[PDB]
């Protein structure tokens, strides 16, 4: 595990992560597979896309095909068919999103969402999964505010032990450990609980609990409280979001890692994102339309097919459709950060960011 | 043009020279309905070996209609494959649907979109596939569920619309099949195929057969269409190409296939391997670290077990089912490939006592 910082524009970082299947330059954005899928993509797209890293949820996993099946399999890797990166989720969020669940410092109980049967989950059983699932880059398990504001200083009190408690069972080689910092829309929470992790010590921070609802002001401020207690010198990874726009304002306030379902599952409803901003190809202004998708794309699908097309497969309900926009929005989404990494070593990232922001408003 | 290379017995190794390409027959075309094969790119079909795939017109003409796939030169263009594609005419389609007006002039049906009434006659769909610029186009013809006197009706139904079908037929760069029907009537496939090579096309297809009748009177029937039809055209059994039929057809002289069953029971969650079908949702793959086919080398054999297979059918997963579709054609595309070597090398009835054998 190393990271470094090769220039930086403001708050924004050009860095480079080293890790056991490969080198992830950073600023990054991860896709985003739950059960060891990335949503109709192979990992020949995602290779072809440019894709250096993804991140694979592990709640769903450990739940089915559950861990003995990828211990045979010698790992998450070789499961999936994917030979660079992966980043595990903790699960945090989908846990502690269940109802009627049953939380103490031990752990969490709840009624698995396959099967209904009753789970238990800790730090312990948490970063055993991972272990055994042989990710790159492993999150400590965390207690994520479904909340008051009583609330999510108990969910980050809890937070602190069980990063502990994580950190102790971590007992592995050539995989990264980061930490998670809690705390709401609550500054004093969210400057104790990057004060807290960072006396543990990690190999990365994640900001947790944040694009969940709140407003987007308290989004960027409470990433500006938290990087502001957190190392020049590991990634900083922000938890979930993923849209352009915010993207490239959290890069502004100094953050590396990213991942979102966004790009996939509204390709899935038949959106693009394009450097113009979103593409609805169910509009009728693409009905008769002969021009691809995204005029500076270089894409499988940018290069072979109109918007006509595509508008066509929507229309008839035909999955083929919602395929050709995956894999378009995914080359997107790397060629985006592609441009803010270049933008930074050029000196030209409030340019970029500014034509970024204008088209998604 | 069309060239027999080499015969085993009744067994065709042949060539047809199309505007978009030159396909190598016997062949299997995997077909699809709305300008696509369901789940595949164009490259995952190139990246399987697919020289020419088929496309259904009916539909087509609906959604997006022809003014769309005319602006965009043509319905390769269209889909972005660019090797030669037969378009079927519909009359399947139309035998499939509920409560139509049939006669002399046409068909009169309700429109699977819309509920509108629909007219589609020989020269309108002549028009269709002229604007999409395939590379065979097929005659619209009548097909045939039925007492003798029913099936007489149709067949010489289709005689005179093969002939109307061929007078609107104006074009350039396209080839023209005609469509040999008859039911289990021996002498009325002799004579619809006396009529139609009569009138003279670039290729026959065999029709309204594997729709219900007896498997003993599918092959019959297909040796008696045979029998009249010149051995220097290509022979097209329409539908129902599952493994151990193409096999039987390819033996009584049939050149060319089509089905949905490969992408369709992919879809389903099944496998056509070499050793017969592969339930991918079977409880036993559960823990499999072998691939869906040991004899493949296609992208989903090469990388993914059986395990993660199931597993993402388990979960719902579409992927699950673009794999097994880039699986079961790449298989259907491979079978074809070693009919034509073992025709050349003379070994075509191990291969076929195979394919009997765990396609039964
Ligand atoms: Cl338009
Ligand atoms: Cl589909
Ligand atoms: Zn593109
Ligand atoms: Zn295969």
Redesign the interface.
């Given at each position: 595990m190393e990271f470094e910082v090769k220039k930086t524009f403001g708050k924004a970082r050009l860095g480079v992560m080293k890790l056991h299947h490969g080198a992830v330059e950073t600023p990054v954005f991860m896709p985003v597979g739950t059960?060891?899928?990335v949503?109709?993509?192979?990992?020949?797209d995602l290779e072809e896309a440019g894709a250096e890293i993804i991140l694979s949820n592990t709640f769903?996993l450990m739940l089915?095909?559950g861990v003995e099946?990828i211990k045979?399999?010698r790992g998450l890797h070789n499961?999936?068919?994917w030979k660079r990166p992966i980043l595990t989720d903790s699960g945090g969020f989908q846990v502690f999103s269940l109802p009627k669940i049953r939380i103490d410092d031990e752990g969490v109980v709840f009624r698995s969402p396959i099967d209904g049967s009753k789970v238990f989950l800790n730090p312990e059983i948490s970063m055993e999964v991972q272990i055994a699932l042989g990710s790159d880059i492993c999150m400590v398990f965390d207690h994520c505010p479904v909340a008051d504001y009583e609330e999510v200083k108990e969910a980050t009190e809890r937070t602190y032990r069980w990063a502990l408690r994580s950190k102790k069972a971590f007992k592995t080689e050539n995989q990264a450990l980061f930490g998670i910092v809690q705390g709401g829309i609550y500054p004093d929470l969210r400057r104790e609980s990057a004060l807290q992790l960072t006396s543990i010590g990690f190999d990365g921070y994640a900001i947790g609990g944040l694009s969940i609802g709140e407003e987007r002001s308290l989004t960027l401020e409470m990433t500006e409280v938290t990087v502001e207690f957190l190392p020049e010198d590991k990634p900083r990874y922000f938890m979930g979001g993923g849209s352009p726009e915010l993207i490239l304002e959290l890069v502004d306030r100094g953050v590396d890692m990213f991942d979102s379902v966004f790009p996939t599952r509204i390709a899935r409803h038949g959106t693009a994102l394009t450097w113009n901003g979103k593409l609805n190809l169910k509009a009728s202004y693409n009905?008769?339309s002969?021009e691809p998708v995204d005029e500076r794309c270089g894409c499988?699908t940018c290069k072979?097919?109109?918007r006509?097309?595509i508008h066509?497969?929507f229309?008839?309900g035909?999955?083929?459709g919602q395929?050709?926009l995956t894999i378009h929005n995914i080359n997107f989404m790397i060629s985006l950060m592609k441009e803010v990494r270049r933008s930074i070593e050029s000196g030209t990232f409030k340019e970029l960011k500014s034509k970024v922001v204008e088209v998604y408003s």
């Amino acid at each position: 595990m190393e990271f470094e910082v090769k220039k930086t524009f403001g708050k924004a970082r050009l860095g480079v992560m080293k890790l056991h299947h490969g080198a992830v330059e950073t600023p990054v954005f991860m896709p985003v597979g739950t059960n060891a899928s990335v949503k109709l993509l192979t990992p020949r797209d995602l290779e072809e896309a440019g894709a250096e890293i993804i991140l694979s949820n592990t709640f769903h996993l450990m739940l089915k095909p559950g861990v003995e099946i990828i211990k045979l399999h010698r790992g998450l890797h070789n499961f999936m068919g994917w030979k660079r990166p992966i980043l595990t989720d903790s699960g945090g969020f989908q846990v502690f999103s269940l109802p009627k669940i049953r939380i103490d410092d031990e752990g969490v109980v709840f009624r698995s969402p396959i099967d209904g049967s009753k789970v238990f989950l800790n730090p312990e059983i948490s970063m055993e999964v991972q272990i055994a699932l042989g990710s790159d880059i492993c999150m400590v398990f965390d207690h994520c505010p479904v909340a008051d504001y009583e609330e999510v200083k108990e969910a980050t009190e809890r937070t602190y032990r069980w990063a502990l408690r994580s950190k102790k069972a971590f007992k592995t080689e050539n995989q990264a450990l980061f930490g998670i910092v809690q705390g709401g829309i609550y500054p004093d929470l969210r400057r104790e609980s990057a004060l807290q992790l960072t006396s543990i010590g990690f190999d990365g921070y994640a900001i947790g609990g944040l694009s969940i609802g709140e407003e987007r002001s308290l989004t960027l401020e409470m990433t500006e409280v938290t990087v502001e207690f957190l190392p020049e010198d590991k990634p900083r990874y922000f938890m979930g979001g993923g849209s352009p726009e915010l993207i490239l304002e959290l890069v502004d306030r100094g953050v590396d890692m990213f991942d979102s379902v966004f790009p996939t599952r509204i390709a899935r409803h038949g959106t693009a994102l394009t450097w113009n901003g979103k593409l609805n190809l169910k509009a009728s202004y693409n009905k008769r339309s002969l021009e691809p998708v995204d005029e500076r794309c270089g894409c499988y699908t940018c290069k072979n097919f109109t918007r006509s097309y595509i508008h066509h497969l929507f229309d008839r309900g035909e999955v083929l459709g919602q395929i050709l926009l995956t894999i378009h929005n995914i080359n997107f989404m790397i060629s985006l950060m592609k441009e803010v990494r270049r933008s930074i070593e050029s000196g030209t990232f409030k340019e970029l960011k500014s034509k970024v922001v204008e088209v998604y408003s």
